[PDB]
């Protein structure tokens, strides 16, 4: 299913998505994503909207 990631970085703001079999797999993708993009911080997940949020 479609998982979503909200980027609340000090430097970087945006929406992004991935397709994954579960949320754990999607999280790995999104973790590399914010890391590839110089964003690191507080992650939260809401399984009801399948949306992760990172906050610098």
Swiss-Prot record:
This is Immunoglobulin G-binding protein G. The chain holds residues 304 to 357 of 593 of the full protein. It is found in: Secreted, Cell wall. It comes from the Bacteria. Sequence repeats lie at residues 3-56.
């Amino acid at each position: 299913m479609q998982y979503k990631l909200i980027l609340n970085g000090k430097t970087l703001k945006g929406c992004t998505t991935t397709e994954a079999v579960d949320a754990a797999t999607a999280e790995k993708v999104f973790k590399q994503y914010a890391n590839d993009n110089g964003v690191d911080g507080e992650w939260t997940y809401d399984d009801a909207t399948k949306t992760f949020t990172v906050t610098e």
